[PDB]
Structure 1
Amino acid sequence: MNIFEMLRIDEGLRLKIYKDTEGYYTIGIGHLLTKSPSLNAAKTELDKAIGRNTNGVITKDEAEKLFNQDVDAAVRGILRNAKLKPVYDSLDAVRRAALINMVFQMGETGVAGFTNSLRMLQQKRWDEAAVNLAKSRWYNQTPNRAKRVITTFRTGTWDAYK
């Protein structure tokens, strides 16, 4: 298992514009297009992201290309963030994947807001960080996915995904 297979399981794959769990226009493997309510504003962002007139539909190769860029961006945002970087540097390979997953889903700013949990992860207090991470809107809104990420932090294995 690796970050790509992990996020592919969590996000799924859709080749036509769809609405995410929050009602936002998305496409491919969890690629958010816009928070705007307008489907047209979504097709406009989509065409600009792909470089062609898509009419709201993309190919599997186009989805995977957006995915590769989004994973790269999440990793680079972690490495540039003064709050995230030190946590990331401190973790083992598996747990690093979990942090990437959270950043991919809620953005660097969102994750950097989990001040207490981050401190607990850096200290390697696994059980405590898992309890703290669950007291969140994140956990309450997407509980199955959150439990999977939290178990990954707790155990340091890919068990929740196998």
Structure 2
Amino acid sequence: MNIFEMLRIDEGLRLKIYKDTEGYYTIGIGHLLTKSPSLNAAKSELDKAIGRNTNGVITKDEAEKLFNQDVDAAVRGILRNAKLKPVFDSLDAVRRAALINMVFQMGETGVAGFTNSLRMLQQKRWDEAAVNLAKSRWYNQTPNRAKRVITTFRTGTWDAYK
């Protein structure tokens, strides 16, 4: 297991524009296109992202290309963020992937605001951090996925993805 396999499990693979769990136009492996309710706006973002006229459909290789860019972008966001980088640097590789997962889903700014959870993670108070992480809109709206990510923070194992 690794961050790419982890996020493929959590995000799936769809080659046509679909709406994600928040109702937003998405494609590929969790590649958010736009929060606009306009399908034409999402198609325009998609064409720009892929570099050709797609009319809403892409290939598996194209989906994996956006996925690599998006994982890269999550790591880049963590390392440039004054709140996330110390936490990330403090963690083992399995728990680092749990943090990348959260940033992929909610964005750098969203996760950086989890101030109390981030502190419990930095203190390595794993059960307390896990309890705090679940007191969130994130957990209530996507509980099965949040439970997998939280179990990864709590244990430092891949047991929730086996």
TM-score normalised per structure 2: 1.00
Q: Alpha-carbon deviation of 1:101?
A: 0.1
Q: Distance in 2 between matches of 1:143 and 1:77?
A: 24
Q: Alpha-carbon deviation of 1:6?
A: 0.1
Q: Distance in 2 between matches of 1:139 and 1:68?
A: 25
RMSD after superposition? 0.2
Q: Distance in 1 between matches of 2:153 and 2:45?
A: 34
1:24 aligned partner: 24
Task: For residue 34 of structure 1, give the secondary structure of its aligned residue in structure 2.
Answer: coil
Q: Alpha-carbon deviation of 1:87?
A: 0.1
Identity within the alignment, %: 99
Q: Distance in 2 between matches of 1:10 and 1:65?
A: 17
Q: Alpha-carbon deviation of 1:34?
A: 0.3
- Which whole-Å deviations, capped at 9, do the CAs of 1:128-154 have from their partners, x for residues lacking one? 000000000000000000000000000
Task: For residue 9 of structure 1, give the secondary structure of its aligned residue in structure 2.
Answer: helix
Q: Distance in 1 between matches of 2:76 and 2:140?
A: 28
Q: Distance in 2 between matches of 1:5 and 1:125?
A: 27
- Which whole-Å deviations, capped at 9, do the CAs of 1:27-73 have from their partners, x for residues lacking one? 00000000000000000000000000001000000000000000000
The answer for unaligned runs of 5 or more in structure 1 is: none
Q: Distance in 2 between matches of 1:126 and 1:18?
A: 36
1:131 aligned partner: 131
Q: Alpha-carbon deviation of 1:95?
A: 0.1
The answer for unaligned runs of 5 or more in structure 2 is: none
Task: For residue 17 of structure 2, give the secondary structure of its aligned residue in structure 1.
Answer: strand
Q: Alpha-carbon deviation of 1:89?
A: 0.3
Q: Distance in 2 between matches of 1:2 and 1:149?
A: 13
Q: Distance in 1 between matches of 2:134 and 2:28?
A: 28
Q: Alpha-carbon deviation of 1:26?
A: 0.1
Q: Distance in 2 between matches of 1:145 and 1:58?
A: 26
Q: Distance in 1 between matches of 2:84 and 2:136?
A: 18
Q: Distance in 2 between matches of 1:68 and 1:138?
A: 24
2:84 aligned partner: 84
Aligned length: 162
